[model samples]
Target: PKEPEQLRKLFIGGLSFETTDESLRSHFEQWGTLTDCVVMRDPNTKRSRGFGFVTYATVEEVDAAMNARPHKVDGRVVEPKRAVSHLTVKKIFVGGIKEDTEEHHLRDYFEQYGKIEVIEIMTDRGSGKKRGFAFVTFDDHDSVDKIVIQKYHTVNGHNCEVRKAL
Candidate 1:
């Protein structure tokens, strides 16, 4: 079957560290059938990152979940916001980043374009070495267009390329 559209997905934040995928699903599943559910975790430690995402089968289900706010999952009140899904494409890929470039540097430079939701500088899992590339997700999708239209960006005195993520 085809995948559900953007509106059916929700970004669940402020989750308790103890919250697991099963717990998250169990909590939100009361509203409607879940298409997908997961708690974001540290890739290395496998610990909860205090956030998760829940995707419902339909937009009406999402609306129902949203209407029943003040969700307390795992003894913590979770905040639910509409996710900026791949369909809307709020994230951009930045390449040629300097090895010394930090997340703050990306935030400092890109904040001019829009409010950033997340900044991830890729690193090797084995060596923990900077991968010379990063992903920047903005709260507004238009920020991607603003950055990509320029094509080239200079972060921390090093030239870089910015393009919409595939």
Candidate 2:
């Protein structure tokens, strides 16, 4: 199957709580014309979530914007990286995890494969107990491929199943 064309969008993080959509756009506009820009907010509280996205008109502009790193907006330095669609960068699903396995344990086990970005161990909301599964996101997509190829991993003496998240 043919791959989809990459979008000229950037994910902006570490934004100040005071940053607004207009201010976010203003900072990125110096690089190129923006097709869309937004500072994500909490739906219920209507407060800034300290992250947002900016879509430029062209990929060239996206590059130009990122090349000039160390962006400062609303009195704080913000981070900008090319946006990856959820479908493109799949998270790794780890099952059969031992209850004692914590985020640090998973990190220590998986760090050999690649740079880890996020590790979320599923838990029951009511009882606050481990669900024997976790979702792991890596900075590089190849890390997931490397992990899935192994199929199984031993963490905390438990044989766990690993697969690309659906």
Candidate 3:
């Protein structure tokens, strides 16, 4: 019938990448509020065959996503669904790293806000220079907010830009 409120966002995973908007709609009834879904696809082929994403409108729906099913598709357990059940979100793509930036440096910069969890700084394959890009992950949202969103982070002369997980 009706869904709960507050399940604002969720991550629906483990679907055939062949998923389309309509295909995604067809599969969300068992849980709760599903406002929008985007199954990313190959730019040229426009196909779905392996994995996809779904977004629910309410936090109640998002929470419901955690215990929705037995991972079934086409009358069978479809291999244990790992729903977008996680609470914190910090999909990251970092760029504009300085030449000398390192994991420890990034951590030191970000740790002022929260606990440092993971950092992946890309390097030039040949020259081994810091490739001007990196992936930094804080343990939770509040840290990311303090470090990235609240203008509390900068490294060297380059102010970093942090966004969804690359």
Candidate 4:
């Protein structure tokens, strides 16, 4: 198993109430490629509530777009943003494993960094062989931040990969 080496995509929130698709496009165009821009509105009232979503094609796009501006169409300042992207590389899986591996052993490996939330192992009922993977949830955000995905982590001599849980 190996860590995903791809950039993350995110859904961005917090836009000017009056900002239209064009303005949002123009605004976000400064940051990165605007793959999609949408301003949710009440169907009955036909008005914006001062927040919208922006989808950036790549992590660099999201970062650059987020840094571009923090104001709305009406010149009113808004919250930086609420991210809904799964680009986070947290929650890893230790693959090519064996049935003997236990939660305590997984905890022991990850505990070197900090506290662990839960370490669960899956077993096949037919032959009772290890599924070759375990769900490792870390208590800290650093699990994704500092942990190297490719060749950065290993358990029971098995190379592992990390990704946001589906």
Candidate 5:
């Protein structure tokens, strides 16, 4: 069967902790012209988050790369898959929050991005103490792009790790 030529983006996981933007680009560029490539990183410490995205100029190139998965890069076998399945990626998981964080404070911090629909602070089943993380929903999906990709977003001096809800 012939693969489509319109899809161009790929989600690459299993990246080495040391993988850099340039190194990721170096490996995938073999398939075709890559319009964009990035290894998710912690902005404050500049550490690799062990995953990334690659965008080729053509879907054929995307398929070419996806078929070539389990790619050995930076001392690890990296896997590449189509990123289109994530078009609906919106809900964000916020981790490393202080236990004392309040709902209003969480709302205030995120409301700056857009209208937040919900904020769920996980709690202990019996103790009723905060589990130190939260799930947030944005009324505007665009807010995910701004918040998820941001590095080390801090609230009340605590560095928060944000990513798409799995």
Candidate 6:
């Protein structure tokens, strides 16, 4: 099957909290005509969420926008990269953990694969007891793939099931 074409939109992150819609549009217009620009905001306070998106009309314009580095807004460098607006990052679940599973233990076992961002061992809210399953979030998807591909990892001789968290 042919791979789907990615959108010509870029995710602009690390934006100044006070960034305005007009400022974002004006800054990116130098690359090419923009199809759309938006600064995400909080619902309650209606404050800038510190990030936004910019969409170009074509792939050529997208490439131009990306190569034109050091995008700045409000005196801070606003970083822009190709946006994967369609997909949600999937967290990997490492199940069948021993009752004594610890965050550090999960880390020690998984760190060999790659850099880890968050290692959370599911627990009971009231009792604060280990729940025999944990969710591991990584800085990049490579670590998650490593765990899934290495299936049957054991802790205390217990074979664990590594799969995408539903």
Q: Residue 131 in candidate 3 has what lDDT? A: 78
Q: On a 0 to 100 scale, what is the lDDT of residue 98 in model 6?
A: 65
Model 1: how far is 56 from its true place, Å?
0.4
Best by lDDT: 1
lDDT of 4 at 21: 71
Tens-digit lDDT string for candidate 2 (66-154): 66777889899987766553344548899998688899889999987667888999999999999989999887654565466453589
After aligning candidate 1 to the native by TM-score, how far in Å is the CA of 91 from where it should be?
A: 24
Off by over 4 Å in 1: 1-4, 85-166
- Model 5, backbone clash pairs (residues 3+ apart or across chains), number: 0
Q: Candidate 4 has which clashing residue pairs, if any?
A: 2-161, 17-50
Model 5: which residue pairs collide? none
Local lDDT at 129 for model 2: 95
Candidate 2: give the clashing pairs: none
Can you write out model 5's per-residue Cα lDDT over 1-166, one digit (the tens) per residue? 4333225677788999989889999999988898889999899998888899988887668656755655899889976656542444557888888798878878989988767888999999999999999988987454675566455688767889888885
lDDT minimum window of 10 residues, candidate 2: 1-10
Q: Please, what are the lDDT tens digits per residue for candidate 1 over residues 51-117?
A: 8899999876876887688798989998887766234578999999969999999999999877899
Report the lDDT tens digits of candidate 6 across residue range 1-166: 3212345677888999988889999998889888789999999999999999988777668667766677777789986766542223447888899697778778888777556788888889999888899988876543454356453787556688888565
Clashing pairs in 1: none
- Reference-based TM-score, model 2: 0.49
Each candidate's lDDT (Cα)?
0.84, 0.81, 0.57, 0.59, 0.78, 0.74
Per-model TM against the reference: 0.50, 0.49, 0.41, 0.43, 0.48, 0.48
Backbone clashes for every candidate come to 0, 0, 18, 2, 0, 0
